[PDB]
From a paper:
PP2A is a major S/T phosphatase in the cell and is generally assembled as a trimeric enzyme composed of a 65 kD structural subunit (A), a 36 kD catalytic subunit (C), and a regulatory subunit (B) of varying sizes. The A and C subunits interact to form the dimeric core enzyme, which only gains its full activity, subcellular localization, and substrate specificity after interacting with one of the many regulatory B subunits to form the trimeric holoenzyme. Instead, PP2A depends on its B subunit to recognize and bind to specific sequence motifs that are often distal from the phosphosite but help to position the phosphosite in the active site of the catalytic C subunit of the PP2A heterotrimer. We have previously shown that Eya3 recruits PP2A–B55α to dephosphorylate pT58 on Myc, increasing Myc stability and enhancing primary tumor growth of triple-negative breast cancer (TNBC).
We determined the cryo-EM structure of the PP2A–B55 + Eya3 complex to an overall resolution of 3.7 Å. The structure of PP2A–B55 + Eya3 shows the typical PP2A architecture with its horseshoe-shaped structural A subunit interacting with the more globular regulatory B subunit (which is a WD domain made of a seven-blade β-propeller) and catalytic C subunit. The middle portion of the C-terminal tail (residues 298–303) interacts extensively with residues on β3D of blade 3 in B55, and the end of the C-terminal tail (residues 304–309) extends to the interface between the A and B55 subunits and interacts with both subunits through hydrogen bonds and van der Waals interactions. Despite the presence of full-length Eya3 in the complex, only the density for a stretch of extended peptide is visible in the structure. We did not observe any significant density for the full-length Eya3 even at low contour level, in the 2D classes or unsharpened map, after local refinement, or 3D classification with a mask around the peptide. This is likely because the entire NTD (residues 1–250) that contains the peptide interacting with B55 is unstructured. Using the information from our previous biochemical studies that a peptide segment between residues 53 and 90 in Eya3 binds to B55 (46) as well as residues Y77Eya3 and H79Eya3 are critical for Eya3 and PP2A–B55 interaction, we can model residues 73 to 79 into this stretch of density. The modeled Eya3 peptide (residues 65–86) interacts mostly with residues on blades 3 and 4 of the β-propeller on the B55 surface (including residues on the β2D and β3A loop, β3B and β3C loop, and β3D and β4A loop) and with residues on the α1 and α2 helix positioned above blade 5, as well as the α2 and β6A loop. In particular, residue H79Eya3 forms pi–pi or pi–cation stacking with H179B55 and a hydrogen bond with D197B55. Furthermore, Y77Eya3 forms a hydrogen bond with the main chain carbonyl of L225B55, and K75Eya3 forms another hydrogen bond with Y337B55.
Residue numbers in the entry:
A (entry chain D): 65 to 86
B (entry chain C): 1 to 309
C (entry chain A): 10 to 589
D (entry chain B): 9 to 447
The structure:
C-alpha cells in the first residue's frame, strides 16, 4: 500500500508535456 | 551631384539585399547617418495619407517579408506602414532591418516605419539581436548604430485623422495626440511610463485594468479604449504586437483591430497572417496568406531522401 | 621575384583563406623555382602537409594532378606519386575522389615500363594496406592501369580484385561492387565468363542490402557485354532473384533501372520474363516502388516487341494502371498521371476512346491539384491523335474548378500553363469560353497573380497576333482603368507597358496613348510617377512628333507636382529620352 | 569464478566536486585502447592505455591521459528561450578509418562529430622573414628556399569535423552507429531520425508516436540501438515495458513493428508503483547478436530474439528496496536512468546500484557478487571482498543495514573492455579501473 494519493506519471518527462510557448 | 551617385548606390544596395547579402560597416554608418538626418524632421505623430497597406510584426522573418512583398505589391508601387518588431528570433533579422531602413532612406515619402517595443538595447541584447550581430559582423558597432537609430522612429501614425496606428496599446496618462506631440522620442523607452504603455500595453476581452505578464505596461479595458475613441473623434484603432491564430482579429466592439504579419511565428505556432489593405474610399479589407515554402532548412522528411535508396 | 617569396610564406600560415589562395597559384611558384627545384625540394613539402581542411586538400589534389608538365614530362611523372598516394588516405570522400581522379588522369602519362615499375606497386600497396580508406581508394584504379601491362601482371591484378571483393568490412565491398562494371568492361570475354560472374553473384547475394543494391547496375553493365546465348545461362537468374528481393531498396533500384535492363537483355527476354516481374513491381507493398514503376510506364511500353506490342499492352499492362489510378498515395497518382498519355499514339483512336478516356476523366476529378496540373500540361499527345473536341467538352470544369480555389500557388500554376492550352486547343473555343478568365485574373487580389496574368497577356498576344488583340483584348482593360482602387489602375498601366512593344505602333498611338495622358492626372501620386515610368518605357516605339506635341508638356507638368518621386522619375525620363 | 582487484583511480580526489565534474558517460573504444569520459559541462577526456612494454607482461598498463577538449558551450534558444544545456549524454566511437580516432558526442540537442589525431612535424624557416619574425627587406631577397619539415614532440588535437544541429524538438537521448559505417540514428523522446554520416543538412524521420492532441501522452521512447551484425534491425525501447523491434526491409517508415516483446504483468505485484518502476532504461544487444538485455529500475532481464511474451532469464539487483520505494519517491531518487553492460563474450552482466555497489550476475553458474568501490580501504594490487546487504536486523560484523545506505552516491554508468576483463566503473566523480587479477 502507499499514501501519495495520485494516478499519474507525467512528472519525470514533464517538458514532453505542453510547455508550449512564451 | 552626390544625390545621383547616392541614389545609384542605394539601388545597388537594395538589389544586393534582395538576394540576402549583407553589407560593410562603412555603408551601414553612412546609411544610419542619412536616416538620422531624414527622421529628425518627422514628429512623433505622423499623418500619412491614404492609400496605404498596413503591416504588422515581422520579427526578423525575412522570407515572410518577401512573401508579403509578393502578396501586397512590390515597393514603392504600394505604400506601406510598418509597426516595428524587426528583431526577436528572426533568422535574418539584420537583413530585414537593413532592408526596411534602406527603403525608408531611399523612399522617405512612400514608406513610413513606426517604433516597436522590442527595439531597445537591453531587449535586443536579451532576445538574440546582439548575438546575431556578433555572429555575423564580428563586433557590436552595427548593433549600437541600429539602437541609436531606433530613437528617431516616430511613436504613432495617423491616416486622414480617423485611422490611428501604433505598435501596442494606449496609456492612462495620455488622452490625445497633443501630449504625443509634446512627448520626446530621443530617449530609451523605460519599463514604466506613458511611452511604455504606448509600446507594451494590450487590450483585453475582460473588463477592468490588468497588468501585462511581460512585466511592463498595464492592460486597458474596453471602457477606456471606447472613451478614447469617441473622445478623439476617430472610427477605429489599428494595433499590432499580439499573436493570433487566424492572422487578424477584431476586438472591443470592432474598435481596436489586431494585425499580425509573420505567418508561422517562431516556426512552430503555425498561425496565419494578413495585411489590412486601405483604399482611397477607406473601405478596409484583409488579405490572408500562408508562409512561403523555403529552402535550406534541415528537413525532417518522412519521404525518403537521396542517400537512403 | 618578390611576389614569389610572398606566396611561399603563405603555404606555411595560420589562415585557411590565405593558404587557399596561395595554393591556388602553385603553377606560378613552380615556374618560378623551375623543374629541377620543384622535383627536388617542393613536392617533399607537399607530401606531408596533411594538417589541413577539406577545400585546401580538394584544390591541392587537382593542382597536383595537373603538374604532369611542370615536373618535366613523361620521365618524372612518377615523382608525383607520394603526395597523391598520401592524399588517397584521408577520410573526406570528396578528397579521396579527387585524388583517385587525378591518379587515373596522370596514369595516361607513364611509359608502360614505368607503369609496371612504379604504378602497379602503388596499386598493390594501396589495395593491401590496413586503413580501409586506402583499399576503398584503390578499388577504382585497376580500370586505367589494366590494358597496358603483361599477362602475369594481369593475373596478379585480377587476384587482387577478387581479394578485394571479398573483404570483411562493408565499405570496401560496396566500393568494389560499384567499379565492378568498369573493371569488367575491359576484361577479355573468356576471362569475363570465367571470373567476373562468380564475384558478381557473390556480391548480388551478399548479407547486406547496401551492397546488393549495386549488383543491379553491375548486371546492366555486364549484360551489355555477353552474347545473347548467355544472358539466360549466366545473368538472368541473378536478375530474377533480385526482382523479388526482401529489402525494398533493391526492388527500387531494379525499378529505377528498368528501361536499360530491357534495352540490354533484348526484347525476347523482356517479353518472356520482365512483364510479369513488372506487374509484380507495380502491385508492390511500398509506396516509392510503385512510384518509380508507374513513372516508368510509357517508355517501357514504347519499346516492346514491334509485332506483339498492342497485344501484350492491352492484355497485361492496362488493368494494373486501372488499379493504380484509384490509389490513396499522392505521389503515385502524381507520377502516373504525368506519363500515362504516351500510350494513346500507340494504342490508336478506337482503343483510346474505349479504355483511356474513362480513366482520363477519372483523373480529371481527383483532389490533389498536382494530378490535374500534370494531366492538363501533358495533353498534346492525345490532342495530336484523337482531336480536342471530345475532351474539351469536359475540360472546362477542370480548368474552372482549378482557377478559383484558395491557395494562390495553384492559380499561378494554371496561369503559367494557360498559354500552352490556348495554343494547343484553338482560338474560337478560347474566345467563346475561356476569355473571361484572363479578365477575371487581371483584377485579382494577390499581386503575384496580377503580374502572372500581365505576362500571360503578352505571351498570348504574341502567340495569336495583334488582330485578335485589338478585337477582344485591350479596350476592356482601358475601360476597367477607372476602378475605385489605385492598384488595379497601376495594373492596367503594367499591361500597357508589357503590351505596347508588340501590339503595333499604330494601334498603340491610336488607342492607348490618350489613356496614358488621362491617367497622368490621377490624384494619388503613385499612379502619376508610374505614368512617368510607363512613358519612359514606351518612348522608343512612339514618334518624336508625338512626343513634342503631347508627351513633352505632360512631362513638364509632372516635373512640378507636390511630391518629389514623380519629379525624380520625370527628370530621368527627360534625360534618357533626350526630351530635356 | 574471477576476482576483482582495485587497480587505478582518476579525476578529483576530494568529495567536494563542482557541477561540471560529474562523470556522465563512459564508453570504451572498439579495440580497447582508448576510453572516453564526458563529464558534465562538456569536458570530454580521453585516456589511452599504456601499451605493453615487453619487459613487463603481467602488468597490463595503467591508463594515462591522451587529450582533452570542450564539447558543448551553454546556449539560449530564443525561439523557446530557456536553457539549452551543456551536458554530455552519449559518446560513441566510429571504427578505425586511418590514424585518426573519430567519436560522436551529444548534448541534449546537437550531435557533433569530433576527431582525435596526432602531429609530430612542423616547418622551420621562411623566405620573407627570419625565424624571429623580424622582417627582412623585401628587396634583400636574392635566393629562394622552401620551408622543410623537421621533427618535433608529439601533439594531439580535437577539431569539430561536422555538426548535426537543429533537428529534434525534444531532448536527444540515444545514438547508435549502424552496421555499415555509413549511417546512424538518434532518438529523442518522441521521434527518431536517421542521419547519414557525411551529410549535415538532412535527415529521415522513421518513427513517430506523437498523438495529435498532446494531452494523452502514454509512451515515450527511452533508448534505441541497432544490431551489431544486421543492417536493418533497430530495437528502440519504450516507457511502459514494451520493446518494439522494427525492420527497415518491409516498409520504409517503420511505424509498423515486426515484434512486440512485452511482459504479461502479474497482479501479484501491482500496488501503487508498477507503472513507474517498469520503465526500460537502456536496451543493449549482445556481442553475439541474439540476446538483448534491458535494465529496468529494479531488475535486469535478458530477452531473446525468438520468444516474444517472456524473458529467457531474470535477475534482481536491489530487490530489498521494494519496501523503501515510498521513501525513495520522496526525493526523486525513484527516477534514475541506470545502465548495464555485457561481457566481451556474453558470459557476465553488470549494473550499478546505490551506495557505490555494482553487482555482476553470472549466466552459466547463476551466482552473483556485490562489490564496493571506495578509495580508502584498498591499494593497487589488493583484492576486493564481496560485500553483503541485509534487509532485517541480522547485522553481524559483515553487512550494511538497509537503513544505512546513502542514496546519494549512485553508480550510474559503467563499461567493460570488449575483449579482456578490465571493467571501468564510473562513480559520481571518479573513473575506477578495476582490473582483473591476471595469473
Amino acid at each position: 500500500n502507499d499514501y501519495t494519493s495520485q494516478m499519474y506519471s507525467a512528472k519525470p518527462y514533464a517538458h514532453i508535456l505542453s510547455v508550449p510557448v512564451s | 551631384m552626390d544625390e545621383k551617385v547616392f541614389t545609384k548606390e542605394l539601388d545597388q544596395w537594395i538589389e544586393q539585399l534582395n538576394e540576402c547579402k549583407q553589407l560593410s560597416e562603412s555603408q551601414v554608418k553612412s546609411l544610419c547617418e542619412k536616416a538620422k538626418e531624414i527622421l529628425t524632421k518627422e514628429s512623433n505623430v505622423q499623418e500619412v495619407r491614404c492609400p496605404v497597406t498596413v503591416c504588422g510584426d515581422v520579427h526578423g522573418q525575412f522570407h515572410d517579408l518577401m512573401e508579403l512583398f509578393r502578396i501586397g505589391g512590390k515597393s514603392p508601387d504600394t505604400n506601406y506602414l510598418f509597426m516595428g518588431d524587426y528583431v526577436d528570433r528572426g533568422y535574418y533579422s539584420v537583413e530585414t532591418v537593413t532592408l526596411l531602413v534602406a527603403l525608408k532612406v531611399r523612399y522617405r515619402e512612400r514608406i513610413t516605419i513606426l517604433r516597436g517595443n522590442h527595439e531597445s538595447r537591453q531587449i535586443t541584447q536579451v532576445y538574440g539581436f546582439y548575438d546575431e550581430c556578433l555572429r555575423k559582423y564580428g563586433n557590436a558597432n552595427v548593433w549600437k548604430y541600429f539602437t541609436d537609430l531606433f530613437d528617431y522612429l516616430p511613436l504613432t501614425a495617423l491616416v486622414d485623422g480617423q485611422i490611428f496606428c501604433l505598435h501596442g496599446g494606449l496609456s492612462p496618462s495620455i488622452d490625445t495626440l497633443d501630449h504625443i506631440r509634446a512627448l520626446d522620442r530621443l530617449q530609451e523607452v523605460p519599463h514604466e511610463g506613458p511611452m511604455c504603455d504606448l509600446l507594451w500595453s494590450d487590450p483585453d476581452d475582460r473588463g477592468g485594468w490588468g497588468i501585462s505578464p511581460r512585466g511592463a505596461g498595464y492592460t486597458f479595458g474596453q471602457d477606456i479604449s471606447e472613451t478614447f475613441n469617441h473622445a478623439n473623434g476617430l472610427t477605429l484603432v489599428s494595433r499590432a504586437h499580439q499573436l493570433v491564430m487566424e492572422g487578424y482579429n477584431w476586438c472591443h466592439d470592432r474598435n481596436v483591430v489586431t494585425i499580425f504579419s509573420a505567418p508561422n511565428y517562431c516556426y512552430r505556432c503555425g498561425n496565419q497572417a494578413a495585411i489590412m489593405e486601405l483604399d482611397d474610399t477607406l473601405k478596409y479589407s484583409f488579405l490572408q496568406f500562408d508562409p512561403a515554402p523555403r529552402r535550406g532548412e534541415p528537413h525532417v522528411t518522412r519521404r525518403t531522401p537521396d542517400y537512403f535508396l | 621575384l618578390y611576389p614569389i617569396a610572398v606566396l611561399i610564406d603563405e603555404l606555411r600560415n595560420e589562415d585557411v583563406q590565405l593558404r587557399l589562395n596561395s595554393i591556388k597559384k602553385l603553377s606560378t611558384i613552380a615556374l618560378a623555382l623551375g623543374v629541377e627545384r620543384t622535383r627536388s625540394e617542393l613536392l617533399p613539402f607537399l607530401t606531408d602537409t596533411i594538417y589541413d581542411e577539406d577545400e585546401v586538400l580538394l584544390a591541392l589534389a587537382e593542382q597536383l594532378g595537373t603538374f604532369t608538365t611542370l615536373v618535366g614530362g613523361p620521365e618524372y611523372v612518377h615523382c608525383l606519386l607520394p603526395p597523391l598516394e598520401s592524399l588517397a588516405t584521408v577520410e573526406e570522400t570528396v578528397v579521396r575522389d579527387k585524388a583517385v581522379e587525378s591518379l587515373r588522369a596522370i596514369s595516361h602519362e607513364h611509359s608502360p615500363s614505368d607503369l609496371e615499375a612504379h604504378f602497379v606497386p602503388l596499386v598493390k600497396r594501396l589495395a593491401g594496406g590496413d586503413w580501409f580508406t586506402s583499399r576503398t581508394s584503390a578499388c577504382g584504379l585497376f580500370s586505367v592501369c589494366y590494358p597496358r601491362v603483361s599477362s602475369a601482371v594481369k593475373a596478379e591484378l585480377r587476384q587482387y580484385f577478387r581479394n578485394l571483393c571479398s573483404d570483411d568490412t562493408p565499405m570496401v565491398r560496396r566500393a568494389a561492387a560499384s567499379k565492378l562494371g568498369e573493371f569488367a568492361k575491359v576484361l577479355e570475354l573468356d576471362n569475363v565468363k570465367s571470373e567476373i560472374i562468380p564475384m558478381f553473384s557473390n556480391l548480388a547475394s551478399d548479407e547486406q542490402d547496401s551492397v546488393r543494391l549495386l549488383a543491379v547496375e553491375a548486371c546492366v553493365n555486364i549484360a551489355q557485354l555477353l552474347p545473347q546465348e548467355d544472358l539466360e545461362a549466366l545473368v538472368m537468374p541473378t536478375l530474377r532473384q533480385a526482382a523479388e528481393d526482401k529489402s525494398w531498396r533493391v526492388r527500387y533500384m531494379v525499378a529505377d533501372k528498368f528501361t536499360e535492363l530491357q534495352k540490354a537483355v533484348g526484347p525476347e527476354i523482356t517479353k518472356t520474363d520482365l512483364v510479369p516481374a513488372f506487374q509484380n513491381l507495380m502491385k508492390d507493398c511500398e509506396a516509392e516502388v510503385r512510384a518509380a514503376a508507374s513513372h516508368k510506364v510509357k517508355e517501357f511500353c514504347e519499346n516492346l516487341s514491334a509485332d506483339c506490342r498492342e497485344n501484350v499492352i492491352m492484355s497485361q499492362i492496362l488493368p494494373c494502371i486501372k488499379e493504380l489510378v484509384s490509389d490513396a498515395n499522392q505521389h503515385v497518382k502524381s507520377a502516373l498521371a504525368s506519363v500515362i498519355m504516351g500510350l494513346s499514339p500507340i494504342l490508336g483512336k478506337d482503343n483510346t476512346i474505349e479504355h483511356l478516356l474513362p480513366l482520363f476523366l477519372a483523373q480529371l476529378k481527383d483532389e490533389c491539384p498536382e494530378v490535374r496540373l500534370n494531366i492538363i500540361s501533358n495533353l498534346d499527345c492525345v490532342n495530336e491523335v484523337i482531336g480536342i473536341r471530345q475532351l474539351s467538352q469536359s475540360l472546362l470544369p477542370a480548368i474552372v474548378e482549378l482557377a478559383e480555389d484558395a491557395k494562390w500557388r495553384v492559380r499561378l500554376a494554371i496561369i503559367e500553363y494557360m498559354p500552352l492550352l490556348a495554343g494547343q486547343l484553338g482560338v474560337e473555343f478560347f474566345d467563346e469560353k475561356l476569355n473571361s478568365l484572363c479578365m477575371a485574373w487581371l483584377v485579382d487580389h494577390v499581386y503575384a497573380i496580377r503580374e502572372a496574368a500581365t505576362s500571360n497577356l503578352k505571351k498570348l498576344v504574341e502567340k495569336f497576333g495583334k488582330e485578335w488583340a485589338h478585337a477582344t483584348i485591350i479596350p476592356k482593360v482601358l475601360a476597367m482603368s477607372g476602378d475605385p482602387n489605385y492598384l488595379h489602375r497601376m495594373t492596367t498601366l503594367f499591361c500597357i507597358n508589357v503590351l505596347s512593344e508588340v501590339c503595333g505602333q499604330d494601334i498603340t498611338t491610336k488607342h492607348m496613348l490618350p489613356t496614358v495622358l488621362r491617367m497622368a492626372g490621377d490624384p494619388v501620386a503613385n499612379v502619376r510617377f508610374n505614368v512617368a515610368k510607363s512613358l519612359q518605357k514606351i518612348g522608343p516605339i512612339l514618334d518624336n512628333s508625338t512626343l513634342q506635341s503631347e508627351v513633352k508638356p505632360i512631362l513638364e507638368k509632372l516635373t512640378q507636382d507636390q511630391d518629389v518621386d514623380v519629379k525624380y522619375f520625370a527628370q530621368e525620363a527627360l534625360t534618357v529620352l533626350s526630351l530635356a | 569464478d574471477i576476482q576483482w582487484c582495485f587497480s587505478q583511480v582518476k579525476g578529483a580526489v576530494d568529495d567536494d566536486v563542482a557541477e561540471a565534474d560529474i562523470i556522465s558517460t563512459v564508453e570504451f573504444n572498439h579495440s580497447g585502447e582508448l576510453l572516453a569520459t564526458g563529464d558534465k559541462g562538456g569536458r570530454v577526456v580521453i585516456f589511452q592505455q599504456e601499451q605493453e612494454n615487453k619487459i613487463q607482461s603481467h602488468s597490463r598498463g595503467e591508463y594515462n591521459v591522451y587529450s582533452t577538449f570542450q564539447s558543448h558551450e551553454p546556449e539560449f534558444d530564443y525561439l523557446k528561450s530557456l536553457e539549452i544545456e551543456e551536458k554530455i549524454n552519449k559518446i560513441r566511437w566510429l571504427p578505425q578509418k586511418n590514424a585518426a580516432q573519430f567519436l560522436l558526442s551529444t548534448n541534449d540537442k546537437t550531435i557533433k562529430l569530433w576527431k582525435i589525431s596526432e602531429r609530430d612535424k612542423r616547418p622551420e624557416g621562411y623566405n620573407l622573414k627570419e625565424e624571429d619574425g623580424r622582417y627582412r627587406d623585401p628587396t634583400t631577397v636574392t635566393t629562394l628556399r622552401v620551408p622543410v619539415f623537421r621533427p618535433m614532440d608529439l601533439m594531439v588535437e580535437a577539431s569539430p569535423r561536422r555538426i548535426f544541429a537543429n533537428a529534434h524538438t525534444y531532448h536527444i537521448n540515444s545514438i547508435s552507429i549502424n552496421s555499415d559505417y555509413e549511417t546512424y540514428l538518434s532518438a529523442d523522446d518522441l521521434r527518431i531520425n536517421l542521419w547519414h554520416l557525411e551529410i549535415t543538412d538532412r535527415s529521415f524521420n522513421i518513427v513517430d508516436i506523437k498523438p495529435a492532441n498532446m494531452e494523452e501522452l502514454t509512451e515515450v521512447i527511452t533508448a534505441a540501438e541497432f544490431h551489431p551484425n544486421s543492417c536493418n534491425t533497430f530495437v528502440y525501447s519504450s516507457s511502459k515495458g514494451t520493446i518494439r523491434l522494427c525492420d527497415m526491409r518491409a516498409s520504409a517508415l517503420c511505424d509498423r513493428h515486426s515484434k512486440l516483446f512485452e511482459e504479461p504483468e502479474d497482479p501479484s505485484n501491482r500496488s501503487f508503483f508498477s507503472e513507474i518502476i517498469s520503465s526500460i532504461s537502456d536496451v543493449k544487444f549482445s556481442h553475439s547478436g541474439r540476446y538483448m538485455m534491458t535494465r529496468d529500475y529494479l531488475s535486469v532481464k535478458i530477452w531473446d530474439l525468438n520468444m516474444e511474451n517472456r524473458p529467457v532469464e531474470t535477475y534482481q539487483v536491489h530487490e530489498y528496496l521494494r519496501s523503501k520505494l515510498c521513501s525513495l519517491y520522496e526525493n526523486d531518487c525513484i527516477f534514475d536512468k541506470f545502465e548495464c553492460c555485457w561481457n566481451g563474450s556474453d558470459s557476465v552482466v553488470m549494473t550499478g546500484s546505490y551506495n557505490n555497489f555494482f553487482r555482476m550476475f553470472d549466466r552459466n553458474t547463476k551466482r552473483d557478487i556485490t562489490l564496493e568501490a571506495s578509495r580508502e580501504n584498498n591499494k593497487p594490487r589488493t583484492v576486493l571482498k564481496p560485500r553483503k546487504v541485509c534487509a532485517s536486523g541480522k547485522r553481524k560484523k559483515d553487512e550494511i543495514s538497509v537503513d544505512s545506505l546513502d542514496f546519494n552516491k549512485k553508480i550510474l554508468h559503467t563499461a567493460w573492455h570488449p575483449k579482456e576483463n578490465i571493467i571501468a566503473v564510473a562513480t559520481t566523480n571518479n573513473l575506477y579501473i578495476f582490473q582483473d587479477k591476471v595469473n
